[PDB]
Structures are given as C-alpha cells and as structure tokens.
Amino acid sequence: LSEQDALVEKIFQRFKKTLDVIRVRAGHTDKNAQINLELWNAFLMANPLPVTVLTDQHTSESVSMAKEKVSNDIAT
Amino acid sequence: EQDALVEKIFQRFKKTLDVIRVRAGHTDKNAQINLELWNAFLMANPLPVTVLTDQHTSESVSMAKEKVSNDIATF
Amino acid sequence: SEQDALVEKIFQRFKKTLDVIRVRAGHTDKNAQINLELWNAFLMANPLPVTVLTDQHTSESVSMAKEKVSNDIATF
Amino acid sequence: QDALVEKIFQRFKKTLDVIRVRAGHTDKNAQINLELWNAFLMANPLPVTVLTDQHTSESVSMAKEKVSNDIATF
Ligand SMILES: [Cl-]
Ligand SMILES: [Cl-]
Ligand SMILES: [Cl-]
Ligand SMILES: [Cl-]
Ligand SMILES: [Cl-]
Ligand SMILES: [Cl-]
Ligand SMILES: [Cl-]
Ligand SMILES: [Cl-]
Ligand SMILES: [Cl-]
Ligand SMILES: [Cl-]
Ligand SMILES: [Cl-]
Ligand SMILES: [Mg+2]
Ligand SMILES: [Mg+2]
Ligand SMILES: [Mg+2]
C-alpha cells in the first residue's frame, strides 16, 4: 500500500525474470545431482570397491590430470 | 523517474547476475550430460539389482560423504 | 549522483549473499567440467559397444533413481 | 535510506535463500562425486587417461548433442 513498499515490489519485479531463471535451473541441477549420487550408490553396491581411497589419502593420476586440464581451461 | 532508478539498480547488478546465471547454466547442462552418460554406461553394463540409498548406502558413498562434510566444515 | 549513491548502497547490502552464490557456482562449474573429463577418460579406456541414450531407452536403474529422488523432493 | 535498503534486501531474501541452499547442496554433491570418481579409479585404474582435448569419446559427443537438443526444446 505504501509508496516505499510499491517501489520495493517494483524493484523485485524488475529482477523476477532473472531470479526465476537462476532459481528454476538450480532446482533442476540439484535434482540431477541427487540422481547422480543414487546412481553412484547402485553402481558401487553392484560393483563394490575392496578399499575406498579418497583424495586426501591418495589422488588418482586420472583425477590430477583432469583437474589440471580444467584449471588450464578456466585460466585460458 | 522511478523507473529510471529501478533500471539503474538492475544494471548495477547485471554483471554479477550474468556470471551466476552463466555458471549455473553450464552446470545444469553438464549435469544433464552426466545423466545421459550414466544411462549409456548402465545400458552397456547393467546392474542385476539397483540398490538405492534408502535401501542401503554403500560404505564407499558414506566415506565420501563424511570426508566432504569435513572438507566443507574446515574449508 | 544522489541516485548512484543509493544504487551503490543497495548493491553493497547484497554483495555478501551474491559473493557466496557466485563463488559456489564457480566451484560447481569447475567440478562439473572435471566430471565430464573423467567420464571421457573412463569411456576411452572402457568403451561402450553402443551408446544408448534415454530417448532411445532409459535404463531401469536410471528410472528407479529418478523416481526415488522425485518422491524425496515431493515429501520434503 | 538504510531502512529502504533493508526493505529491498528482505524482499529478495527468500528467493536468494532458495538459490543459495540449492547451490550449496549442488556444490557439496559435486565434491562427493569427485571423491567417488577418485575411489573408483584408484580401485579400477586406467592404463592411459585420455582427456577431451586429446580425443573426445563418441559416447560423450553423442550425449552432448542429445542434451543440446533437449535444452533447445525443453
Ligand atoms: Cl596423491
Ligand atoms: Cl594414481
Ligand atoms: Cl556462455
Ligand atoms: Cl545420500
Ligand atoms: Cl535416502
Ligand atoms: Cl545403509
Ligand atoms: Cl556397503
Ligand atoms: Cl524406456
Ligand atoms: Cl533397463
Ligand atoms: Cl575428438
Ligand atoms: Cl570414441
Ligand atoms: Mg563388477
Ligand atoms: Mg557424475
Ligand atoms: Mg577393475
């Protein structure tokens, strides 16, 4: 009702389209990330690892190489 | 008048919102690619049974979750 | 310049929230790129005789994971 | 002025919270994904690691093309 509130609502409406795109996409990405973890779970239950070696214990050379490539990509 | 102020506010935010929007957009695209690759991989290498985390969480998944939780707490 | 001082104040109020979102989006984008590189190396070393995508046929494992996560999102 | 600035932020807070929470869980899950790749590849090592700049797997190319069509139509 107040003129200040009307301005605040107008500011939000100017941002709404952009925020909607970000928010909706973040929802789809979050859902897909959860599906990815469920697929990892089913895959590893069916194909178990004798030991689970995480990066703080030892980083696979494949992971190191992939990280270095993407780092160079981002640096360009 | 009022609209010119509102447009000025949005333009001040645009570059930051663009960076966020572009990064989230490519992440969403890559997440969709990731699922298609899972599909092709599992079609070629099927699982006799599909065990989801509500039935049983793999010890490997639990260890990875615990490690990442410690990383996020200390990073 | 009176409007610009207010516009700058509004941005500074949001900066901390926007920085957190932007920095995480950057780390997530980098990790998603690494994930694709690891798929590439994994599939080059372990090629698929045929590549069946979900529009041709959706693996029952993918269908089950999608349904589980969809129920998770609906209940939460 | 400051009361107006806070009103603007509070109007956006709920939308920004949803975005922040979703992005945070996605970032966490992406980290878990990389740790699982590490454990999987330590247990099942690759004789050579071929990245996309050397050669892109036909499976990756096909998946990329399908997803591009999906994003264009959805
Ligand atoms: Cl190491
Ligand atoms: Cl290694
Ligand atoms: Cl782009
Ligand atoms: Cl989980
Ligand atoms: Cl669960
Ligand atoms: Cl369990
Ligand atoms: Cl287990
Ligand atoms: Cl199907
Ligand atoms: Cl199937
Ligand atoms: Cl190529
Ligand atoms: Cl190939
Ligand atoms: Mg096996
Ligand atoms: Mg993955
Ligand atoms: Mg093996």
PDB file of N, CA, C and O in Angstrom, chain A residues 41, chain B residues 57-67, chain D residues 36:
ATOM      1  N   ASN A  41      25.536 -44.846  -5.906  1.00  0.00           N
ATOM      2  CA  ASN A  41      25.256 -45.839  -4.870  1.00  0.00           C
ATOM      3  C   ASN A  41      24.911 -47.197  -5.467  1.00  0.00           C
ATOM      4  O   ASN A  41      25.472 -48.222  -5.064  1.00  0.00           O
TER       5      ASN A  41
ATOM      6  N   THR B  57      23.016 -47.760   1.892  1.00  0.00           N
ATOM      7  CA  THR B  57      24.008 -46.798   1.425  1.00  0.00           C
ATOM      8  C   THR B  57      25.354 -47.504   1.380  1.00  0.00           C
ATOM      9  O   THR B  57      25.789 -48.083   2.384  1.00  0.00           O
ATOM     10  N   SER B  58      25.982 -47.496   0.210  1.00  0.00           N
ATOM     11  CA  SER B  58      27.297 -48.104   0.050  1.00  0.00           C
ATOM     12  C   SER B  58      28.286 -47.489   1.032  1.00  0.00           C
ATOM     13  O   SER B  58      28.285 -46.279   1.252  1.00  0.00           O
ATOM     14  N   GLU B  59      29.140 -48.331   1.620  1.00  0.00           N
ATOM     15  CA  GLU B  59      30.177 -47.811   2.505  1.00  0.00           C
ATOM     16  C   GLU B  59      31.067 -46.800   1.790  1.00  0.00           C
ATOM     17  O   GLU B  59      31.547 -45.846   2.413  1.00  0.00           O
ATOM     18  N   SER B  60      31.297 -46.983   0.488  1.00  0.00           N
ATOM     19  CA  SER B  60      32.086 -46.005  -0.260  1.00  0.00           C
ATOM     20  C   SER B  60      31.396 -44.649  -0.309  1.00  0.00           C
ATOM     21  O   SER B  60      32.056 -43.604  -0.211  1.00  0.00           O
ATOM     22  N   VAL B  61      30.072 -44.643  -0.489  1.00  0.00           N
ATOM     23  CA  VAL B  61      29.325 -43.388  -0.507  1.00  0.00           C
ATOM     24  C   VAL B  61      29.358 -42.723   0.863  1.00  0.00           C
ATOM     25  O   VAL B  61      29.553 -41.505   0.972  1.00  0.00           O
ATOM     26  N   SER B  62      29.173 -43.507   1.926  1.00  0.00           N
ATOM     27  CA  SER B  62      29.236 -42.964   3.282  1.00  0.00           C
ATOM     28  C   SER B  62      30.597 -42.340   3.569  1.00  0.00           C
ATOM     29  O   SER B  62      30.685 -41.256   4.155  1.00  0.00           O
ATOM     30  N   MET B  63      31.675 -43.031   3.199  1.00  0.00           N
ATOM     31  CA  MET B  63      33.008 -42.478   3.426  1.00  0.00           C
ATOM     32  C   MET B  63      33.215 -41.191   2.638  1.00  0.00           C
ATOM     33  O   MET B  63      33.784 -40.222   3.158  1.00  0.00           O
ATOM     34  N   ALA B  64      32.748 -41.153   1.387  1.00  0.00           N
ATOM     35  CA  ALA B  64      32.891 -39.938   0.587  1.00  0.00           C
ATOM     36  C   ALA B  64      32.099 -38.779   1.189  1.00  0.00           C
ATOM     37  O   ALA B  64      32.594 -37.646   1.248  1.00  0.00           O
ATOM     38  N   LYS B  65      30.867 -39.045   1.634  1.00  0.00           N
ATOM     39  CA  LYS B  65      30.043 -38.018   2.268  1.00  0.00           C
ATOM     40  C   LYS B  65      30.701 -37.475   3.528  1.00  0.00           C
ATOM     41  O   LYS B  65      30.710 -36.259   3.760  1.00  0.00           O
ATOM     42  N   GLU B  66      31.232 -38.365   4.371  1.00  0.00           N
ATOM     43  CA  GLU B  66      31.870 -37.926   5.610  1.00  0.00           C
ATOM     44  C   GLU B  66      33.085 -37.054   5.320  1.00  0.00           C
ATOM     45  O   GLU B  66      33.269 -36.000   5.939  1.00  0.00           O
ATOM     46  N   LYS B  67      33.912 -37.469   4.361  1.00  0.00           N
ATOM     47  CA  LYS B  67      35.102 -36.701   4.010  1.00  0.00           C
ATOM     48  C   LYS B  67      34.724 -35.314   3.492  1.00  0.00           C
ATOM     49  O   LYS B  67      35.308 -34.306   3.905  1.00  0.00           O
TER      50      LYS B  67
ATOM     51  N   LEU D  36      34.094 -39.928  -5.197  1.00  0.00           N
ATOM     52  CA  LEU D  36      33.702 -41.253  -5.677  1.00  0.00           C
ATOM     53  C   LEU D  36      34.448 -41.626  -6.957  1.00  0.00           C
ATOM     54  O   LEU D  36      34.888 -42.772  -7.108  1.00  0.00           O
TER      55      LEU D  36
END
